[PDB]
Amino acid sequence: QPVGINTSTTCCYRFINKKIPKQRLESYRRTTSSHCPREAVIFKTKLDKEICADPTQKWVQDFMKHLDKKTQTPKL
């Protein structure tokens, strides 16, 4: 319990325009627009490596669909 350094996440102003390793892409967490001044997507890898990617081109959005895989439960 410091004077303000909380035990939580934050934003990232790094815009990477390079290809992302689909094989190492397993999931991705998104930042909060209300608390973050710039919306960005974070890709989570198997080695706990989170890399922010500029949210503008569909290629990352396309990866999010493949990354999501399981989502809605087809209960009957």
Side-chain angles (χ1 to χ4, degrees):
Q1 271 135 331
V3 279
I5 296 94
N6 249 36
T7 63
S8 64
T9 18
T10 177
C11 293
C12 56
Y13 299 97
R14 291 180 180 186
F15 297 90
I16 299 170
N17 289 335
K18 293 180 180 169
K19 290 180 180 160
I20 302 175
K22 181 180 180 171
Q23 181 180 46
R24 292 180 181 198
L25 279 161
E26 288 298 301
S27 46
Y28 58 94
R29 64 180 300 145
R30 290 181 182 165
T31 326
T32 308
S33 297
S34 294
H35 293 268
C36 206
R38 294 288 189 110
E39 292 180 279
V41 308
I42 300 170
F43 281 103
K44 300 180 292 137
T45 306
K46 290 180 180 180
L47 291 171
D48 291 332
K49 290 180 180 272
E50 300 180 349
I51 299 168
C52 289
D54 190 37
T56 306
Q57 289 174 341
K58 291 181 180 179
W59 73 303
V60 302
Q61 290 172 350
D62 288 331
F63 275 125
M64 289 179 182
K65 290 180 180 162
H66 184 256
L67 290 163
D68 289 340
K69 267 168 67 184
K70 291 180 286 281
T71 300
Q72 291 173 339
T73 64
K75 300 180 180 145
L76 180 68

